[PDB]
Amino acid sequence: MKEYYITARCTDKAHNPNEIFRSRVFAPNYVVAKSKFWMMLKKQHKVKKINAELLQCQPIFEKNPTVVKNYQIFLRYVSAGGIHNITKQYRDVTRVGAVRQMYNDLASQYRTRQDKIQLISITTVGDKAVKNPVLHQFVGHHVKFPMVHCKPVIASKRFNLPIKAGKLTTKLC
Amino acid sequence: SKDKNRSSHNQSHKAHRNGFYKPKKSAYMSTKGMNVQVLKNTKAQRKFALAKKLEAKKAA
């Protein structure tokens, strides 16, 4: 999952060649980003690739991929019944990192595959605007929990024997 | 004992094996059933040019 900045213009009778269409598209690569970008133009402004020129398709990186932020993804997906608008909150350090979480959450809770979800916008909310019941318990400064029933950690697959000698124990960790 | 009446299945594939034989150029140059006066003009001139050419060959 990567984020791209794509611009283009339409040069034909219908559209003046002075209107630039910008976008911020989350795509696995840059070929998919243009594919998403063109369909947005075709379904909204009747602009087709045969009558348009791309200008700049540059990757966008996180300025501070070390600061924890609370996100708020506004999205619309298609179900068996109809189309719905949903808002989901996520905690991550990168914009692209949170989007992959949204895709994995949507595909599990709602069983909605990737070719039904359209991301309208993604912003950053404060520490009190989180409304997810599970995620609201981890925004405070005084949060602590004893991680228990830990499986003992193996340093690497090198020491992973199939049969072990002696009893096996879990960890208060 | 009913049978299947007709099918075009595998008929375009059969037709394109030895493909559409185009007519030769000699087919487009036929002049049967043309204008009677136009035909008379052509025959009259072709007899005039032929006689003149054959006379010169005869002299030498």
Partner: protein, 210 residues
């Protein structure tokens, strides 16, 4: 006797300098133009690609009669076969029709060089002979002003005036096998599949295939 071998060798050296000068000067001009647009706050639209490399992905069984003819006109008659295709409004539509059976994109100069040097061949007297000498290239393409392999590469990459005659001489490269897709080759590359337009990502697939 063979004093012309040194003379022929020098002409290859002189022409190679001219070829590299043309490619580097054109590449430099793009970089300078891009900077001035950034300085002036303008917008720069990169020129559309001219050369397309296409690879046959699917087999030969179960192809529509119209799709079967296009793959013959592009000389993609075998699975794992690569050809170079001129990009225009004619061949772009032709490739879209045969999309499920091909993957294509825009190759880099390094990709073009390695394809010709390692897998290149020519059709001489109806024989698919691999490239082994510049005399074999001078004989085949003498009248087209192509005497060295680096002249063969330069014409292909820049799409010169004699591209069609030069490109037709080259036999379609027979590539190896490589991981075609992430999901499978039954969907478009946009969906994670194998076929379709890969744009500049065809070089990664070609690297594992050459």
């Amino acid at each position: 006797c063979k004093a012309r071998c040194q003379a022929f060798r020098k002409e290859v050296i002189l022409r190679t300098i001219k070829n590299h000068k043309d490619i580097e000067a054109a590449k430099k001009a793009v970089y300078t133009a891009k900077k001035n647009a950034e300085i002036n706050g303008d917008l720069y639209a990169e020129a559309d690609p001219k050369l397309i490399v296409a690879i046959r992905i699917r087999g030969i069984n179960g192809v529509s009669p119209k799709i079967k003819k296009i793959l013959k006109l592009l000389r993609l008659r075998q699975i794992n076969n690569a050809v170079f295709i001129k990009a225009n409004a004619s061949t772009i539509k032709m490739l879209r029709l045969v999309d499920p059976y091909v993957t294509y994109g825009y190759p880099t100069l390094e990709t073009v060089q390695k394809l010709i040097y390692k897998r290149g061949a020519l059709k001489i007297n109806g024989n698919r002979m691999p490239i082994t000498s510049n005399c074999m290239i001078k004989k085949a393409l003498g009248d087209k002003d192509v005497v060295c392999v680096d002249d063969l590469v330069h014409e292909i990459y820049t799409v010169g005036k004699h591209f069609k005659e030069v490109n037709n001489k080259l036999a379609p490269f027979k590539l190896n096998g490589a991981k075609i897709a992430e999901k499978n080759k039954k969907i478009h590359f946009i969906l994670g599949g194998g076929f379709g337009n890969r744009e500049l990502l065809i070089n990664k697939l070609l690297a594992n295939m050459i």
